[PDB]
Ligand binder design. Structure first.
Ligand SMILES: NCCc1cccnc1
Length: 330
């Protein structure tokens, strides 16, 4: 089997991407944030505290003939940005782009933090990291990809995120028309439960490539590119007037600037992020200070190749017995 679904930016800045997902019988379609940095499939639901729902589409398990309470199971997750959610668990039929998993754990939110409430466009998250990170207790549950894997034509999924445009998540096949040149594959460590890999270096603009190992995670659920302070300083030093602002919470730059590109290494290959991908717009409406798309990972504990980086590539998440990651230009 295979699946193919379009993923769409939630706003004009590509702050996140949503992908329609069918849950239950008859289908209830929710727009989920596919997140290769976590491993829970959770949704706004009929159980979510009413004051914490503001415009989201909800899953109502009582209206699904295939929903079953997973008795005694609870979940609770906290993300790197300080957001969180928790609740109980149903199993139900879940389909993405024509690919169907029966008995998928669908984690129903009883509580969500303010940032989730405030984002009316995101109805939940669909985790695509390794199932070892799944938070369901006392019986840990599998991700949609792990459940689907054995049925897939090939044990892979791909992320093809657009810049200010829709893109695609495919399951079970590699669309050889979706990228240019060849795909370079690189080793993955699953020790922390992430798609963790080591970039071979970077360049800023037309500058020389610096060969240096940068361990980080491929995380579709993180908006920005978070890298070591040395790398990030070298980038922003090439933008007149750019500075790190503690009050704003990162590097900002004059909105009048033309940003240089940023290149990262994948083995001997190179992925170029155009400068425009690094512009996240005015810090507040009408401001001439703009927020940067490359930020320091110093306070995080891990480097994160988020959407800013991934959207510059066609990315293969290879879930074979020994997982690997592939990157191609496009
Ligand atoms: N790997 C990104 C985790 C995440 C998801 C949704 C909101 N905040 C953080």
């Amino acid at each position: 089997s295979t699946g193919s679904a379009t993923t769409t930016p939630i706003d004009s800045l590509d702050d996140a991407y949503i992908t329609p997902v069918q849950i239950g019988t008859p289908a209830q379609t929710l727009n989920l944030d596919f997140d290769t940095g976590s491993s829970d499939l959770w949704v706004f639901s009929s159980e979510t505290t009413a004051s914490e729902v503001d415009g989201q589409t909800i899953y109502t398990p009582s209206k699904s003939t295939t929903a079953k309470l997973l008795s005694g199971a609870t979940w609770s997750i906290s993300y790197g940005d300080g957001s969180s959610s928790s609740g109980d668990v149903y199993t139900d039929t879940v389909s993405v782009g024509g690919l169907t998993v029966t008995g998928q754990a669908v984690e129903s939110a009883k509580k969500v933090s303010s940032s989730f409430t405030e984002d009316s466009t995101i109805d939940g998250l669909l985790g695509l990291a390794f199932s070892t990170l799944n938070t369901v207790s006392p019986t840990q549950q599998k991700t949609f990809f792990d459940n689907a894997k054995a049925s897939l034509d090939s044990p892979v999924f791909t992320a093809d995120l657009g810049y200010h445009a829709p893109g695609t998540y495919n399951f079970g096949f590699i669309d050889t028309t979706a990228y240019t040149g060849s795909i370079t594959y690189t080793a993955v460590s699953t020790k922390q439960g992430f798609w963790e890999w080591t970039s071979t270096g970077y360049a800023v603009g037309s500058g020389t490539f610096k060969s240096t190992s940068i361990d980080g995670i491929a995380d579709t659920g993180t908006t920005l590119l978070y890298l070591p302070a040395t790398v990030v300083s070298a980038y922003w030093a090439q933008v007149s007037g750019a500075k790190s602002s503690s009050s704003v919470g990162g590097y900002v730059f004059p909105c009048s600037a033309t940003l240089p590109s940023f290149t990262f290494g994948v083995g001997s290959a190179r992925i170029v992020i155009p400068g425009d991908y690094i512009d996240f717009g005015p810090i507040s409406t009408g401001s001439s200070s703009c927020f940067g798309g490359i930020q320091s990972s110093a306070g995080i504990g891990i480097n994160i190749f988020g959407d800013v980086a991934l959207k510059a590539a066609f990315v293969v998440f290879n879930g074979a017995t020994t997982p690997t990651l592939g990157f191609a230009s496009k």
